[PDB]
Design a protein around this nucleic acid. Structure first.
Lengths: 98, 104, 89, 81, 95, 80, 100, 91
DNA sequence: CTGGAGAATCCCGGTGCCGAGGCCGCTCAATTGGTCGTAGACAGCTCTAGCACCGCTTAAACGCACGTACGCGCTGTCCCCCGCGTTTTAACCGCCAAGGGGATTACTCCCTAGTCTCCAGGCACGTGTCAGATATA
DNA sequence: TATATCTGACACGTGCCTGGAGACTAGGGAGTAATCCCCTTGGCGGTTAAAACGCGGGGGACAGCGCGTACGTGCGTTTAAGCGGTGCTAGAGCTGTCTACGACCAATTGAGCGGCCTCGGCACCGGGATTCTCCAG
């Protein structure tokens, strides 16, 4: 028989897992290349402290996570568990970003 | 150290000169570093005590930023004083909404 | 930094307890944070009364302005006690 | 010239951060738009940060630069001195 | 007719959003301020302009709260504000 | 003084909502708004009186409330 | 006035003195206040321009805080730079909601 | 008592000569100048401090302006300030 | 209505290590001891705005009947995001290799505070006037 | 509304003084040069974790629709808030002391910093019991 988990057990279990851990999530070097790519528009062939870029990744994801908390609350009130783009627009709007 | 003369621990001298070398005001009253350093030592003792307690609550003897995470975020007064502050490698407080959990 | 002082406090509060370097750095950043908060707000507080000296009066009032309730109260207790003890010497 | 390295930050990585962020279910359109939101947020910060670097006329961005930038927007980060 | 629901509301919104004069009764506001102020010192001495500035900041803060609350409602496919919605807004505001 | 939080009546609150652009208001809104406004103002009176008592003054000046609002990141203009 | 010597209006001497004795550092460079007053006077020029347009277009001859209010709320940059500001006696702009 | 009324009125006569001003609007504008004053002076102080400089020059002000104003308004501010400073110190 | 297998997790235990905590020289910054000039503590007093009460005016609050319009639940649809298997590369790390600009020391300077004087710009302060209110024919 | 009379808030005028401009000295912040190196960049090369892809498919987003309560609004009721007016006085602000305190310089010296141990908390690991879950009952 196909060993299959129900929609949510592994997902929430993974949520709990990363709620226990404290390390950075996404891939590092492609992200650093994105950093240099965006950085091209100001000066070409820039030197970067790797740890500063790591700090950028940490603070950026902390920001993203906080946004996920707020849009998550928006989903909670709107009878959803699914985040939508307009919810992000609401959250950033209330924050004052547009 | 003037702290030891007062029976304290934070360096009144370094902070005090940082007040002169920090461009905040033209002159600094004598009681200001004593009073201020006292406030930092007390609040510091609060932070270390909560971090120590939280470290013991996790079968660890060494305090790591995760202990700063649950200790600070489980303290209302630090959460309110640091509502715009997120520290490095702190992570997230575990909290899953009831409507998200399965209904066993 | 502030490592040696935080470790002294560690020996006073939890002697059988260690701390990571990263957390000690967090503590150093917090010390600098609180320092600019009190120094800036106390500085403008002194400016409001057009005073050029920040004394115990201004620091005390500034602490009650900046610090929330119970922590401020105990800060006044420990602070005022401490200033009394060192100033009488 | 490198292009679309923001697509290097992939869909499951977004699922990683979002799942640590407390998200349980994710619309398919969330991923690219969220990459755009992240890009916007970074540009709000990285431009000002590199502007701090350019004031010193240096070619190496220091950690202090990102400290001052994050502090400037009230998104203080501890852990660097 | 009986002045249909919404027309009088929208015109009233236009009129008072079109104007700028103060809208809260002065004596209840001032006495309320002094009454709450009693919990530190009874019988405060106040500048009238101070009372007016508190009325200004207060009403701007409340109106802004209605703006964010209303946007949360409209986003939430509603047009009727609820207290829990306000609590949600302030939580999103960080209160 | 007693019960002056109800002196800022519900019609005045409606005037705010019209100035805020609101069409329908729950009946429980008014008291919750009085609570939020209450805590908010308590914050204003607290630090404001701290400035007044600090200067050994009996009268609250306008500049003090300006400083208080500025501390709370909501700058108020209108005083030269 | 040195402003007129530079072809400006805001007081170079007063701004220069208050900035030097602004308690940030004992010494302040000479061109910084001129640059400062130039930028602020420029800012003054666009806001007085938008306000003038507002009074003229609203059949008014004296500028009041209301014209400042919709002046700011109609200018994206003024809204951005003054995002933490509360305008005394200004009211709000009637931004009309879609459902309303 | 110091104020900025007269200069704002002269600039008003420079932009819209046929437009007048209420006293309250002049006062609130003076408060606005006080705000801009505090923001720029504070940020410039921070900028000079971060690299430990004890003199505020035109470069620190320029960089600070570039930090506070997003894009074209900063471009016109730097343009006008640069023209003003250059033109003044060159005559 | 609930237990059975088995993946996930807890726990027990064993291994290695490198980061953490403790030691050891080595300065220089914190402390003292005065000194100098002044910010500010101090006492008494004006006036004036805040307070406080009287009295007239009416704007504003309150209550009720009514209807609708708004929230909300039931019920129904369906497609899209979760789950899992599969392939693929390109992420990760260790290593190799070059070298720039950051950090340091020192040189050289030119730029701003401080003194002192001087005076017209800038502040306070009435005066005209025109935008606009009022009466009668 | 003509005409004629009547007002008030702001434009325009005045007198007085005090804050900024000149020019100089003096000391020191900043640009500049040179120079070492260490971390930064960029390559090779092996291993494999992980993204991509795709195939179900149950379930969550969403619509329709129907029910019902409650909040708005008109209209009539009721009134204390607001203005003016009168009168008082605490205390903001002023005026006049007068100095002990905080900055400063120089001299002192031990705390605190950088480099260097070395060992055990914790990561990693492997193995068995328990727990939790999905899918059977």
């Amino acid at each position: 028989k196909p060993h299959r988990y129900r929609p949510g057990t592994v997902a929430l279990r993974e949520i709990r897992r990363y709620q226990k851990s404290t390390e950075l999530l996404i891939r590092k070097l492609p992200f650093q290349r994105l950093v240099r790519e965006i950085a091209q528009d100001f000066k070409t062939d820039l030197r970067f402290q790797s740890s500063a870029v790591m700090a950028l990744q940490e603070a950026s994801e902390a920001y993203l996570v906080a946004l996920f908390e707020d849009t998550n609350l928006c989903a909670i009130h709107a009878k959803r568990v699914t985040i939508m783009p307009k919810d992000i627009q609401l959250a950033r709007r209330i924050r004052g970003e547009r | 150290t003037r702290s030891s003369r007062a029976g304290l621990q934070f360096p009144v001298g370094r902070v005090h000169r940082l007040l002169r070398k920090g461009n905040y005001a033209e002159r600094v009253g004598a009681g200001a570093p004593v009073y201020l350093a006292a406030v930092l030592e007390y609040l510091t003792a609060e932070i270390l005590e909560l971090a120590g307690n939280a470290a013991r609550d996790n079968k660890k003897t060494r305090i790591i930023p995760r202990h700063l995470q649950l200790a600070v975020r489980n303290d209302e007064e630090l959460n309110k004083l640091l509502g715009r502050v997120t520290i490095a490698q702190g992570g997230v407080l575990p909290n899953i909404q009831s409507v998200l959990l399965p209904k066993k | 930094s502030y490592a040696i002082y935080v470790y002294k406090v560690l020996k006073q509060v939890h002697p059988d307890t260690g701390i990571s370097s990263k957390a000690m750095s967090i503590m150093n950043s917090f010390v600098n944070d609180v320092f600019e908060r009190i120094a800036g707000e106390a500085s403008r507080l002194a400016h409001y009364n057009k005073r050029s000296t920040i004394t115990s009066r201004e620091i005390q009032t500034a602490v009650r302005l900046l610090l929330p309730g119970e922590l401020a109260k105990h800060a006044v207790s420990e602070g005022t006690k401490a200033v009394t003890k060192y100033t009488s010497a | 010239v490198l292009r679309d390295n923001i697509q290097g930050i992939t869909k499951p990585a977004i699922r990683r951060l979002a799942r640590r962020g407390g998200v349980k279910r994710i619309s398919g359109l969330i991923y690219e738009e969220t990459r755009g939101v992240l890009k916007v947020f970074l540009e709000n910060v990285i431009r000002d940060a590199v502007t701090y670097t350019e004031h010193a006329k240096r070619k190496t961005v220091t950690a202090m630069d990102v400290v001052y930038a994050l502090k400037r927007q009230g998104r203080t980060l501890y852990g660097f001195g």
